[PDB]
From a paper:
The first step in dolichol-PP-oligosaccharide production involves the ER integral membrane enzyme dolichyl-phosphate alpha-N-acetyl-glucosaminyl-phosphotransferase ([name], E.C. 2.7.8.15, also known as [name] [[name]]). It catalyzes the transfer of an N-acetyl-D-glucosamine-1-phosphoryl unit (GlcNAc-1-P) from [name]-N-acetyl glucosamine ([name]-GlcNAc) onto dolichyl phosphate (Dol-P) (Heifetz and Elbein, 1977, Lehrman, 1991). The active site is on the cytoplasmic face of the membrane, formed by the 4 cytoplasmic loops between the TMHs.
The apo WT- and Val264Gly-[name] proteins gave structures to 3.6 Å and 3.2 Å resolution. In the crystals [name] is a dimer formed through a crystallographic 2-fold axis, with an 1850 Å2 interaction surface. In solution, [name] exists predominantly as a dimer, as shown by native mass spectrometry, although the monomer was also detected. WT [name] has an apparent Km of 4.5 ± 0.8 μM and a kcat of 0.21 ± 0.007 min-1 towards [name]-GlcNAc (STAR Methods); Dol-P displayed an apparent Km of 36.3 ± 7.2 μM and a kcat of 0.20 ± 0.012 min-1. Interestingly, phosphatidylglycerol co-purified with [name], even when not added to the purification, suggesting a role for phosphatidylglycerol in the stability of [name]. Comparing the WT and Val264Gly structures showed a small (1–1.5 Å) movement at the C-terminal end of TMH4b towards TMH8, which would affect both the dimer interface and the exact position of EL4, which forms the top of the Dol-P lipid-binding site.
Numbering used by the authors:
A (entry chain A), B (entry chain A): 7 to 79, 91 to 151, 162 to 405
């Protein structure tokens, strides 16, 4: 176990160097490829290369392809290693294809379930435990869970974005938490399930680190949806094949909140604008809250209920107004980023991200305290 | 053996239908993505979607992902099935990324060797025969062969192009030849190596058929380099893991000629222009030969030798001229397409491709006649 992990750490560090180096090397290619855009929360109108998650994702694959013989230098764990690499590779591919082509939201949800198929087949051939603990055999519903886990993690990361270094940053906190957890649980009982998880988590961390080097404020590159697809599948891969998917979903606490808080807007029960990202006040330099103003008559009975319950829960800022066109309701954009600006006022982009990363650390500490009996201590 | 092959044929036919249907469905996406271009050998200036090999390649992957449990419903042949799918998937990905980004020719040659790594690792873990028959153990040089085989097949297909339905068409003749060969050799001796090859060749044939449906004259879509990368790796995958790589390289006869005949121009020993494709005479409707005119003084001593030897072999048409700038030499563009126009005069695009496809059939018949003792018959 320490001998292949040493080799895995060496290739991961070479991969960090590789990502840091290749990202600015391909800058010209992405700009020429029209795979670039402006940073909307910035006064600068310069084009920044998009989908850089494709370069770190590619570096990740090559690193692991080289690593493949070392754990071996038994097949049951080897099939899962090649199978997991197929599922991740397919996802980086279909992820980048979705970035380049901008597929319909319905086709976007099918892509993660498509890429997760080899894991389901490996779990089938290697006779994986279809039973779950509250002792219940899910059988077919367990395979539906595995399929949907890839779809969840990607979109959970993808919905909690809009400020520089958030998507890559939250993934670093999550992967580092899994790394810490794997090491703690490596000492005894489940050694095989946590050594396997480390094999993917260490290269994922260091390639993402190299990406964050360029994505961090002030954003030099964008990660793109390719990164969210890549990250989401890597987390689903380790959680599924490591059997710690429940523990792993607890590291997704800020994402789960942000998702449910967003849900009334996403389902269009409460009016949703094109972009729910904060509005930068040029004179301040900091980011202010964004709003979704709409006609009160056009709002549904269910929507009027949810918006009144969320206002009474002290989560949404509601501003009533009346114009020549009629009466309009200015509802606060429902996302964790805008909720932090409601609670703490206007915050600068670099501090706002860092704060959400700290919030991600807090949740991980909460998970760890539950799992290891540290509630009495703290 | 017939039971999983039946299921493989069913999914392959559904895949044909899928490719035929999805290609025109995504037309809008590619045009908007600026992933489109004009057909240079045509008077029509309309933009035709590029890289459609990504859609057939994707359909291929999904088909095989569904197929994975059926041969099983033993691991040694399963590892190669998942391993081969990883190598092919990685290639479709890095292939499409190269289409979208247009990487340097030196990085383009590293991509196939990168994607072929899982096959090398599977061949390593599953203790593959490093020995070869003229009885010689190549050891390390055998792994270099496997790595370079992917690079060869892709580029061999990629260099023999320039007319509608050639790249997809030549791949259909090659894959159909391998299908026929697998079936002949399935009856006895090596059943496992040919049943494995069929598992990939049948889905490759029917997805390419669906692509050719739209690529065939008059080209509605372009296959892109994504297809050449995809095709090349699938042929290298089956040849390597099926151990019939020598027999398979004989089906690549028109490609091997076209490559070597092109070599003096590619290496720039003899001047090479931007495009060595035929020139369409608007009044004729047919395609005429293309030429590479250059200064005789700028031509190397080795280049003057090769061009004189190729002229004496009755392969290249050389036209000497003298202008105000000085004396210039108008050399014929060295490719199998232009050589066919030198021998048979101007030919229409639809007939020219069909003729090269027939030429590909001839070579396959030659290979089959050698392998099965049919020289006396014909």
């Amino acid at each position: 176990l320490p001998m292949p992990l040493l080799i895995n750490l060496i290739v991961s560090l070479l991969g960090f160097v590789a990502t840091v180096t290749l990202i600015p090397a391909f800058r010209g290619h992405f700009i020429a490829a029209r795979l670039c855009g402006q940073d909307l929360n910035k006064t600068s109108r310069q084009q920044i290369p998009e989908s850089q998650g494709v370069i770190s994702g590619a570096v990740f694959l090559i690193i692991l392809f080289c690593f493949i013989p070392f754990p071996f230098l038994p097949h049951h764990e080897f099939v899962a290693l090649i199978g997991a690499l197929l599922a991740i590779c397919c996802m980086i591919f279909l992820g980048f294809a979705d970035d380049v082509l901008n597929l319909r939201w319905r086709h976007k949800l099918l892509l993660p379930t498509a890429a997760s198929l080899p894991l389901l087949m490996v779990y089938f051939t290697n006779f994986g435990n279809t039973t779950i603990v509250v002792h219940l055999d899910l059988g077919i519903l367990y395979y539906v869970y595995m399929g949907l886990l890839a779809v969840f993690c990607t979109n959970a990361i993808n919905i909690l974005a809009g400020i520089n270094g958030l998507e890559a940053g939250q993934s670093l906190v999550i992967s580092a938490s899994i790394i810490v957890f794997n090491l703690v649980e490596l000492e005894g009982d489940c050694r095989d399930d946590h050594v396997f998880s480390l094999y993917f988590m260490i290269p994922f961390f260091f390639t993402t680190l190299g990406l964050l080097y360029h994505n961090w404020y002030p954003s030099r590159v964008f990660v793109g949806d390719t990164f969210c697809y890549f990250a989401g599948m890597t987390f689903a891969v380790v959680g599924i094949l490591g059997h710690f998917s429940k523990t792993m979903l607890l590291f997704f606490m800020p994402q789960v909140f942000n998702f449910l808080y967003s849900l009334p807007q996403l389902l269009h029960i409460i009016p949703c604008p094109r972009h729910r990202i904060p509005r930068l006040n040029i004179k301040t330099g900091k980011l202010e809250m964004s709003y979704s103003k709409f006609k009160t008559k056009s709002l549904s009975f269910l929507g009027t209920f949810i918006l009144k319950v969320a206002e009474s829960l002290q989560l949404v800022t509601v501003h009533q107004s009346e114009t020549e066109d009629g009466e309009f309701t200015e509802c606060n954009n429902m996302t964790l980023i805008n909720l932090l600006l409601k609670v703490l006022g206007p915050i600068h982009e670099r501090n706002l991200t860092l704060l959400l990363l700290l919030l991600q650390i807090l949740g991980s500490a909460i998970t760890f305290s539950i799992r290891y009996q540290l509630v009495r201590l703290f």
